Design a protein around this motif. Structure first.
Motif, PDB file in Angstrom:
ATOM      1  N   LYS A 214     -27.352  80.694 -14.068  1.00 17.16           N
ATOM      2  CA  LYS A 214     -28.542  79.977 -14.502  1.00 17.16           C
ATOM      3  C   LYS A 214     -29.040  79.142 -13.327  1.00 17.16           C
ATOM      4  N   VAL A 215     -30.338  79.215 -13.052  1.00 21.38           N
ATOM      5  CA  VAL A 215     -30.934  78.453 -11.957  1.00 21.38           C
ATOM      6  C   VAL A 215     -30.685  76.965 -12.150  1.00 21.38           C
TER       7      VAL A 215
ATOM      8  N   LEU B 254     -32.467  83.309 -14.945  1.00 21.10           N
ATOM      9  CA  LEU B 254     -31.177  83.798 -14.471  1.00 21.10           C
ATOM     10  C   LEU B 254     -31.354  84.392 -13.081  1.00 21.10           C
ATOM     11  N   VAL B 255     -30.490  83.993 -12.154  1.00 19.96           N
ATOM     12  CA  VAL B 255     -30.578  84.474 -10.784  1.00 19.96           C
ATOM     13  C   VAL B 255     -29.227  84.916 -10.251  1.00 19.96           C
ATOM     14  N   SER B 256     -29.238  85.598  -9.111  1.00 21.23           N
ATOM     15  CA  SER B 256     -27.997  86.076  -8.514  1.00 21.23           C
ATOM     16  C   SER B 256     -27.846  85.672  -7.056  1.00 21.23           C
ATOM     17  N   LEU B 257     -26.614  85.739  -6.565  1.00 16.45           N
ATOM     18  CA  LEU B 257     -26.313  85.420  -5.175  1.00 16.45           C
ATOM     19  C   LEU B 257     -25.628  86.655  -4.595  1.00 16.45           C
ATOM     20  N   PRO B 258     -26.393  87.744  -4.419  1.00 14.23           N
ATOM     21  CA  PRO B 258     -25.895  89.015  -3.883  1.00 14.23           C
ATOM     22  C   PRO B 258     -25.156  88.921  -2.556  1.00 14.23           C
ATOM     23  N   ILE B 259     -24.248  89.870  -2.345  1.00 13.06           N
ATOM     24  CA  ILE B 259     -23.448  89.953  -1.129  1.00 13.06           C
ATOM     25  C   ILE B 259     -24.168  90.891  -0.164  1.00 13.06           C
ATOM     26  N   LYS B 260     -23.933  90.721   1.134  1.00 13.70           N
ATOM     27  CA  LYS B 260     -24.573  91.581   2.126  1.00 13.70           C
ATOM     28  C   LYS B 260     -24.129  93.030   1.975  1.00 13.70           C
ATOM     29  N   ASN B 261     -24.760  93.917   2.739  1.00 11.00           N
ATOM     30  CA  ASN B 261     -24.441  95.342   2.704  1.00 11.00           C
ATOM     31  C   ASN B 261     -24.624  95.901   1.294  1.00 11.00           C
TER      32      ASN B 261
ATOM     33  N   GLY C  39     -28.289  75.571 -13.371  1.00 14.93           N
ATOM     34  CA  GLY C  39     -26.923  75.268 -12.991  1.00 14.93           C
ATOM     35  C   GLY C  39     -26.775  75.154 -11.484  1.00 14.93           C
ATOM     36  N   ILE C  40     -27.464  76.021 -10.750  1.00 14.69           N
ATOM     37  CA  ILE C  40     -27.406  75.974  -9.294  1.00 14.69           C
ATOM     38  C   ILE C  40     -28.111  74.697  -8.835  1.00 14.69           C
ATOM     39  N   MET C  41     -29.246  74.410  -9.466  1.00 12.74           N
ATOM     40  CA  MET C  41     -30.046  73.219  -9.182  1.00 12.74           C
ATOM     41  C   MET C  41     -29.220  71.954  -9.412  1.00 12.74           C
ATOM     42  N   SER C  42     -28.634  71.854 -10.602  1.00 11.10           N
ATOM     43  CA  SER C  42     -27.824  70.699 -10.971  1.00 11.10           C
ATOM     44  C   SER C  42     -26.625  70.526 -10.049  1.00 11.10           C
ATOM     45  N   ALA C  43     -26.014  71.635  -9.653  1.00 11.86           N
ATOM     46  CA  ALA C  43     -24.862  71.573  -8.763  1.00 11.86           C
ATOM     47  C   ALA C  43     -25.265  70.939  -7.432  1.00 11.86           C
ATOM     48  N   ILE C  44     -26.374  71.395  -6.861  1.00 12.35           N
ATOM     49  CA  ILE C  44     -26.833  70.839  -5.588  1.00 12.35           C
ATOM     50  C   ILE C  44     -27.268  69.385  -5.776  1.00 12.35           C
ATOM     51  N   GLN C  45     -28.054  69.142  -6.818  1.00 14.82           N
ATOM     52  CA  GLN C  45     -28.543  67.810  -7.138  1.00 14.82           C
ATOM     53  C   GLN C  45     -27.439  66.761  -7.258  1.00 14.82           C
ATOM     54  N   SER C  46     -26.376  67.079  -7.990  1.00 11.03           N
ATOM     55  CA  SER C  46     -25.298  66.112  -8.161  1.00 11.03           C
ATOM     56  C   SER C  46     -24.540  65.841  -6.862  1.00 11.03           C
ATOM     57  N   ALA C  47     -24.556  66.790  -5.931  1.00  9.65           N
ATOM     58  CA  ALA C  47     -23.859  66.602  -4.663  1.00  9.65           C
ATOM     59  C   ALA C  47     -24.711  65.868  -3.622  1.00  9.65           C
TER      60      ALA C  47
ATOM     61  N   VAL D 228     -35.491  72.701  -3.620  1.00 10.37           N
ATOM     62  CA  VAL D 228     -36.560  73.583  -4.044  1.00 10.37           C
ATOM     63  C   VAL D 228     -35.940  74.963  -3.829  1.00 10.37           C
ATOM     64  N   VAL D 229     -36.048  75.837  -4.822  1.00 11.96           N
ATOM     65  CA  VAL D 229     -35.480  77.175  -4.707  1.00 11.96           C
ATOM     66  C   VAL D 229     -36.532  78.265  -4.866  1.00 11.96           C
ATOM     67  N   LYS D 230     -36.465  79.271  -3.999  1.00 12.54           N
ATOM     68  CA  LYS D 230     -37.383  80.401  -4.043  1.00 12.54           C
ATOM     69  C   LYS D 230     -36.546  81.655  -4.267  1.00 12.54           C
ATOM     70  N   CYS D 231     -37.081  82.584  -5.052  1.00 16.34           N
ATOM     71  CA  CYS D 231     -36.378  83.824  -5.359  1.00 16.34           C
ATOM     72  C   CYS D 231     -37.108  85.077  -4.932  1.00 16.34           C
ATOM     73  N   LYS D 232     -36.340  86.150  -4.809  1.00 21.42           N
ATOM     74  CA  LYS D 232     -36.865  87.446  -4.432  1.00 21.42           C
ATOM     75  C   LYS D 232     -36.495  88.378  -5.578  1.00 21.42           C
ATOM     76  N   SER D 233     -37.461  88.611  -6.464  1.00 16.90           N
ATOM     77  CA  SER D 233     -37.294  89.477  -7.628  1.00 16.90           C
ATOM     78  C   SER D 233     -36.383  88.883  -8.698  1.00 16.90           C
ATOM     79  N   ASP D 234     -35.189  88.469  -8.290  1.00 19.12           N
ATOM     80  CA  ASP D 234     -34.225  87.887  -9.213  1.00 19.12           C
ATOM     81  C   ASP D 234     -33.054  87.238  -8.477  1.00 19.12           C
ATOM     82  N   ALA D 235     -33.009  87.424  -7.165  1.00 19.71           N
ATOM     83  CA  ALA D 235     -31.943  86.863  -6.343  1.00 19.71           C
ATOM     84  C   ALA D 235     -32.423  85.640  -5.564  1.00 19.71           C
ATOM     85  N   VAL D 236     -31.554  84.644  -5.431  1.00 18.74           N
ATOM     86  CA  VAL D 236     -31.895  83.441  -4.683  1.00 18.74           C
ATOM     87  C   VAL D 236     -32.091  83.821  -3.217  1.00 18.74           C
ATOM     88  N   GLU D 237     -33.283  83.556  -2.695  1.00 22.39           N
ATOM     89  CA  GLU D 237     -33.587  83.885  -1.312  1.00 22.39           C
ATOM     90  C   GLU D 237     -33.625  82.672  -0.396  1.00 22.39           C
TER      91      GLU D 237
END
Length: 203
Positions: free
Chosen positions: A145-146, A196-203, A148-156, A162-171
């Motif tokens: 959940k975005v 809902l977003v993803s943090l895809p792995i390279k390759n 959740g990612i937002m809150s995680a960064i915010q609390s730290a 500010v978050v930008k996405c590419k189709s559905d993955a955090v870019e």
């Protein structure tokens, strides 16, 4: 031009950028997926920004001792040359310097200070580490959940990214700093990422 108001440190999620050439970092399988530097942008509070300002031309000699760090933490994820301020650039570094780095004066007085200061902030606030310690890890199957990612960064950081996405993955993730390098809130901006977003792995 009017002196910039604040700094935006933009970070790129390598996994989303790699979803061939020596310049392209997508081939470096040895490197773990995570955030790398997109740029350090002098910005204006109204949402616009100064660009292609006066200043010395890009000089790789000036940042030679930063070459290993810029190659690893500020890589490019494409082979076609980029362009800015009227000409093609030999690298992402020349591009960011011409377009944004030159506009960081007088706060940052030269290229070396511009790039080294960006690396300093990048190393100080490891966003990849903040997310990992909160359960948000690189994955080609996980959907987070975005909020959740937002809150995680915010609390730290005590500031909202500010978050930008590419189709559905955090870019891209943007963290703002005042002219004294203190974390601050970025200008109000509407959400653009899916719930809902993803943090895809390279390759």
């Amino acid at each position: 031009h009017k002196e910039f108001d604040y700094f935006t440190l933009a970070l790129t999620w390598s996994g989303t950028e790699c979803l061939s050439c020596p310049t392209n970092a997508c081939s470096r399988s040895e490197v773990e997926t995570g955030f790398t530097i997109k740029g350090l942008w002098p910005d204006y509070d109204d949402g616009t920004w100064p660009s292609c300002c006066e200043g010395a031309k890009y000089d790789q000699n000036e940042i030679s001792i930063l070459s290993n760090d810029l190659s690893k933490y500020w890589p490019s994820y494409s082979c076609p040359s980029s362009s800015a301020c009227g000409s093609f650039d030999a690298s992402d570094l020349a591009y960011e310097w011409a377009k944004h780095g030159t506009c960081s004066s007088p706060v940052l007085g030269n290229q070396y200070e511009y790039f080294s200061t960006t690396l300093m902030l990048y190393f100080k606030y490891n966003i990849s580490e903040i997310l990992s310690e909160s359960g948000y890890l690189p994955s080609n199957t996980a959907e987070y959940k975005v909020e959740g990612i937002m809150s995680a960064i915010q609390s730290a950081l005590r500031v909202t990214p500010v978050v930008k996405c590419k189709s559905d993955a955090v870019e891209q993730v943007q963290i703002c700093f005042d002219k004294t390098l203190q974390l601050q809130e970025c200008p109000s901006t509407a959400s653009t990422c899916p719930s809902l977003v993803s943090l895809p792995i390279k390759n």
